[PDB]
Amino acid sequence: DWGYDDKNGPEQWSKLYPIANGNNQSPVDIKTSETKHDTSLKPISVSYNPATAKEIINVGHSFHVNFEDNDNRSVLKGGPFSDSYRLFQFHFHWGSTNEHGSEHTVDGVKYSAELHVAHWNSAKYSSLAEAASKADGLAVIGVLMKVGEANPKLQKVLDALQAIKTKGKRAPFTNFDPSTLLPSSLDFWTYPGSLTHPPLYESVTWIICKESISVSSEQLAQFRSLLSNVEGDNAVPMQHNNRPTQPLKGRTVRASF
Ligand SMILES: NS(=O)(=O)c1ccc(NC(=O)NCCNCc2ccccc2F)cc1
Ligand SMILES: [Zn+2]
C-alpha cells in the first residue's frame, strides 16, 4: 500500500514501482530559461458538458471528482494534440503548510496546491483502462494554486467534502463544468511525463498553465481536514499528497508563449 508518509511515500515508491526512477517521470521543475517556444503549438481548447459530472470519492490519499466518459460531451483539443481527449476526472494536490503543496514548480518556486484535470485519448483507444498505460494515452492540465484570496469557483467542491469525510465514502456530484476552475489565460508549457503517483505510468502529456489561480489559507485547510482513515477508526487527516519534482533526463519543456 503506497502513500505519502515516510515509510510508504515517494522516496520509497521505486521498491514496488521501478518506473519511479524512469526517464519520463512527473512532476518536474520548469526552468523558464530552458523552455523552448514552439510555434506549432495551437491554443488549448476545452469544451465540457456539466451533465457529465458524476461522483466525488474519498480515495484515502486524496479525493477525486469523476465524470461520465461514454461519449465526447466533454473534451480537450488543440495544444500539442491532433487527437481529441475525453475528460474523466479532476483532483487536487496540497501540502502540509502553505509554503508548498504544488507538484510542478516554476523556476524553483513552490505553490500551495495544484489542480489536475485529466483526460484520455478516445480517438485511439476504447477506454480509460486501455489508454492509461499508453505513451499517448493521457492528457492532464495542471494549474498552480497560489495562496491568497478565497476562490469562489471552488465552492461546490468544498461544500461536497463534508459528505465524503472518510476513506471510501462517495456521493453524487452533478451539473458542474470544471473549465470554470481554469485561469483566464490558457498559455501553457507542455512536456511528456507520467502519473505523479503509483502506478506512475509514463503515459501523460502534461499541459501546465502559466497563469495561477488563487486559493485561501482556509480553503486549503478544508482539503487537509479530509480523513485518510475509514469511518470509526482514529482520525488521520490528509496532510499532504504532493510528489517531489523529478529529473528531466533530457526532456524538453515547450512553451506555447
Ligand atoms: N496526479 S495525476 O498524474 O493527474 C494522476 C494520477 C493517477 C491517476 N489514476 C489513473 O489514471 N487510474 C486509471 C488507470 N487505468 C486503470 C488501470 C489499468 C491498468 C493498471 C491499473 C489501472 F488502475 C490519474 C491521474
Ligand atoms: Zn494529480
Swiss-Prot record:
Cofactor(s) in the UniProt record: Zn(2+)
Q: Which GO molecular function annotations are given, in alphabetical order? A: arylesterase activity; carbonate dehydratase activity; cyanamide hydratase activity; hydro-lyase activity; zinc ion binding
User: Disulfide bond: is it a keyword of this entry?
Assistant: no
Q: Family membership, please give it.
A: Belongs to the alpha-carbonic anhydrase family.
Protein's organism: Homo sapiens (Human)
Q: Summarize where Zn(2+) 2 binds, as residue positions.
A: 61, 64, 197
- What PROSITE patterns does the annotation carry? ALPHA_CA_1 (PS00162), ALPHA_CA_2 (PS51144)
Report residues binding substrate: 196-197
Regarding activators and inhibitors, the annotation says: Activated by histamine, imidazole, L-adrenaline, L- and D-histidine, and L- and D-phenylalanine. Inhibited by coumarins, sulfonamide derivatives such as acetazolamide, benzenesulfonamide and derivatives (4-carboxyethylbenzene-sulfonamide, 4-carboxyethylbenzene-sulfonamide ethyl ester, 4-(acetyl-2-aminoethyl)benzene-sulfonamide, 4-aminoethylbenzene-sulfonamide), and 'prong inhibitors' BR15, BR17, BR22 and BR30. Activated by a short exposition to Foscarnet (phosphonoformate trisodium salt), but inhibited by a long one. Esterase activity weakly reduced by cyanamide.
Enzyme kind, highest EC tier:
lyase
**Catalytic residues (positions):** 61 (proton donor/acceptor)
Residues holding Zn(2+) 1: 91, 93, 116
For this entry, the protein name equals Carbonic anhydrase 1
Q: Where does this protein reside within or beyond the cell?
A: Cytoplasm
Q: State a GO cellular component annotated for this protein.
A: cytosol
Assigned keywords, A-Z: Acetylation, Cytoplasm, Lyase, Metal-binding, Zinc
Q: Give the reactions, separated by semicolons, that this protein catalyses.
A: hydrogencarbonate + H(+) = CO2 + H2O; urea = cyanamide + H2O
Please give the residue ranges the record annotates as the region Disordered.
1-27, 237-257
Record function comment: Catalyzes the reversible hydration of carbon dioxide. Can hydrate cyanamide to urea.
Q: Does the keyword Hydrolase apply?
A: no
Domain (Alpha-carbonic anhydrase): give its ranges. Answer: 1-257
EC number assigned by the record: 4.2.1.1, 4.2.1.69
